Amino acid sequence: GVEEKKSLEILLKDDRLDTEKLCTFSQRFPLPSMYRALVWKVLLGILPPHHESHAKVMMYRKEQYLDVLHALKVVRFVSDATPQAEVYLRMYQLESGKLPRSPSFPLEPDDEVFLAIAKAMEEMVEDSVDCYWITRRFVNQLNTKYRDSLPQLPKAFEQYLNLEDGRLLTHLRMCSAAPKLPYDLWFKRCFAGCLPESSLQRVWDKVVSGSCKILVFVAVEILLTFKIKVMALNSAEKITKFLENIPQDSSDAIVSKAIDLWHKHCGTPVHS
Amino acid sequence: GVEEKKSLEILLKDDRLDTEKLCTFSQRFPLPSMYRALVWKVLLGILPPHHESHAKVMMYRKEQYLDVLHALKVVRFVSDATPQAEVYLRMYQLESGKLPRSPSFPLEPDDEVFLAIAKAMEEMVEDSVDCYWITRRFVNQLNTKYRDSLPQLPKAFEQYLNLEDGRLLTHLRMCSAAPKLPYDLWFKRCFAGCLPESSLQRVWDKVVSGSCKILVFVAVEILLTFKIKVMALNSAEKITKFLENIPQDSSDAIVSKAIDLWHKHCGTPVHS
Amino acid sequence: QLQAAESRYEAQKRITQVFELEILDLYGRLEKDGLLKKLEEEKAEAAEAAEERL
Amino acid sequence: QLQAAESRYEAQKRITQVFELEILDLYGRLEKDGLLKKLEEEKAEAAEAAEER
């Protein structure tokens, strides 16, 4: 996609960036590797649209990141033994009141979601500060902007699996696997730890730019892709294990197919 | 005061307050008790001249004072046992990076200057926040605005004692008392610890509004007032002891005469 | 007003530098007698979990 | 940008509340054995009196 790229460059050259235009471009086509972190940052409001203010704001963010890192070290909550994702978890927890009594106190179910997304972000975003900031904002969007939609997604999944392949849904129901499907993996962690980040990022392009329905179509798509192997599985036990641990090499295809599906069922607008 | 107070009220009702008008008034006249803390605050720039912003600005100052106070308590430097002036010394030292190892480490020569000015402020200004703030600012003036003049003051003292009573200055010289005079009492502590606060404050009205020469004239005036008793002293020793501990109930006079002397030699204007 | 608030913030960073030094000092002091008993106390906070896992 | 810096100040206060708790915690732990040695650190400093002196 060059000309996908040129068309994006022409938007990025505006003194004030069109947030709404950057959104619909992301919904329509995938972001080129070299501009992904930048667009996500603008869309998650980590850089203001006003192009000049970038360095001024990036400073504040870097300085805050360092201050917070240091404070965590002063207390015993992080050390250099600490992995980057746990570091972001504590930074988030600090900046939000919610920091546990000690670093050993066990991890509450939502913390593990943060960890999951953060580990994935690490592979998508090189800079350590951008990475923190995007993870913090990404997760914050699930807890606010999508707070009401996310619990509706398991239903949507059944609605759309059905139109695409009824028999498979029936088979899921017959094995009483439908209530045992790994929904949190799909709609809490948005597929972090499930799809290789090189493809997951194209899904997140959409999540970042305002759509969480796309998540449903990745789920439907994972099922269509492994229709044959799943219809062969008798226990609900066997089904859940498989969907927790899916073969990796089809993912490029799953994600593109998923995006198509979602357009087919929902559509999206035009871009120069 | 009236026709002196009325004149001041007229300047207080300016929507933006005139620093320079308020200064020359303070140099001319003594501030009425009810407006002293307010005028000192504006002149020390604790409240901006813009009359609306007072409430907003006092709010920040209150919160600074509380934040710092708490910290000192957390760290065991102050308790409720601690006298107000020691509390302000620590608050000062904190906000200036100059906080000792522990509160028991004994007090450096400059800290006792602070304590002295602080104890005096405690008598001039009821409000605990106003008082810290004014003390802080007052002191900060000695270290900044007045740092070049303050060590030239003992010479001005010789200059002006001489003009007022040459014989006395000779006598001081004959006992070689001139190097041993309590200069830091007069020119570092500005008479804190020496003159009762009800009179000292009229001296400080002048120091606050920008002149530190007044301190010279308070010293000259102390000496003329005790001309006869000093002329009677043989040791330089005996002269220093006396000036370290001068009788109190002449002060109102000493200070008024001192203010006159200073006007005579240095001048100041009238008003609307 | 900008200066009045900036003033506070600077005092705020002051406060923390003081806190920091205290913390580093109290660690040192508690270091004289092994704080590993502290870590021990921890090892327990993963034992009440297991029970806390009920 | 207003929000970016205001954000940090918030984090600054956040930082100090954390540090506060640690400090109160560490005092507690040292309290298990008398902080008296703190009362020795004190006198000795006051003893640092004559020293300076």
From Swiss-Prot, chains A, B:
Domain of life: Eukaryota
Tissue distribution of the protein: Highly expressed in heart, and slightly in kidney, liver and placenta.
Gene Ontology terms for molecular function: GTPase activator activity; small GTPase binding; TSC1-TSC2 complex binding
Subcellular location: Lysosome membrane; Cytoplasmic vesicle; Cytoplasm, Cytosol
InterPro entries referenced in this protein's UniProt entry, alphabetically: Rab-GAP-TBC_dom, Rab-GAP_TBC_sf, TBC1D7, TBC1D7_dom2
Record domain Rab-GAP TBC: where: 30-211
Location, primary (coarse class): membrane
Free-text function comment from the UniProt entry: Non-catalytic component of the TSC-TBC complex, a multiprotein complex that acts as a negative regulator of the canonical mTORC1 complex, an evolutionarily conserved central nutrient sensor that stimulates anabolic reactions and macromolecule biosynthesis to promote cellular biomass generation and growth. The TSC-TBC complex acts as a GTPase-activating protein (GAP) for the small GTPase RHEB, a direct activator of the protein kinase activity of mTORC1.
Disease field: Macrocephaly/megalencephaly syndrome, autosomal recessive: An autosomal recessive disorder characterized by abnormal enlargement of the cerebral hemispheres, intellectual disability, large head, optic atrophy and underdeveloped skeletal musculature. Head enlargement may be evident at birth or the head may become abnormally large in the early years of life. Additional clinical features include behavioral abnormalities, psychosis, learning difficulties, prognathism, myopia and astigmatism.
Protein name: TBC1 domain family member 7
UniProt organism field: Homo sapiens (Human)
Lineage of the species this protein comes from: Eukaryota, Metazoa, Chordata, Craniata, Vertebrata
Gene field: TBC1D7
Swiss-Prot record, chain D:
Subcellular location: Lysosome membrane; Cytoplasm, Cytosol
Effect of residue 19 to A: Abolished interaction with TBC1D7
Distribution of this protein across tissues and organs: Highly expressed in skeletal muscle, followed by heart, brain, placenta, pancreas, lung, liver and kidney. Also expressed in embryonic kidney cells.
Signal peptide per UniProt: none
Domain remarks: The C-terminal putative coiled-coil domain is necessary for interaction with TSC2.
Its biological purpose: Non-catalytic component of the TSC-TBC complex, a multiprotein complex that acts as a negative regulator of the canonical mTORC1 complex, an evolutionarily conserved central nutrient sensor that stimulates anabolic reactions and macromolecule biosynthesis to promote cellular biomass generation and growth. The TSC-TBC complex acts as a GTPase-activating protein (GAP) for the small GTPase RHEB, a direct activator of the protein kinase activity of mTORC1.
SUBUNIT field: Component of the TSC-TBC complex (also named Rhebulator complex), composed of 2 molecules of TSC1, 2 molecules of TSC2 and 1 molecule of TBC1D7. Probably forms a complex composed of chaperones HSP90 and HSP70, co-chaperones STIP1/HOP, CDC37, PPP5C, PTGES3/p23, TSC1 and client protein TSC2. Forms a complex composed of chaperones HSP90 and HSP70, co-chaperones CDC37, PPP5C, TSC1 and client protein TSC2, CDK4, AKT, RAF1 and NR3C1; this complex does not contain co-chaperones STIP1/HOP and PTGES3/p23.
Involvement in disorder: Tuberous sclerosis 1: An autosomal dominant multi-system disorder that affects especially the brain, kidneys, heart, and skin. It is characterized by hamartomas (benign overgrowths predominantly of a cell or tissue type that occurs normally in the organ) and hamartias (developmental abnormalities of tissue combination). Clinical manifestations include epilepsy, learning difficulties, behavioral problems, and skin lesions. Seizures can be intractable and premature death can occur from a variety of disease-associated causes. Lymphangioleiomyomatosis: Progressive and often fatal lung disease characterized by a diffuse proliferation of abnormal smooth muscle cells in the lungs. It affects almost exclusively young women and can occur as an isolated disorder or in association with tuberous sclerosis complex.
The name this protein goes by in its record: Hamartin
Residues of the full protein shown: 940 to 992 of 1164
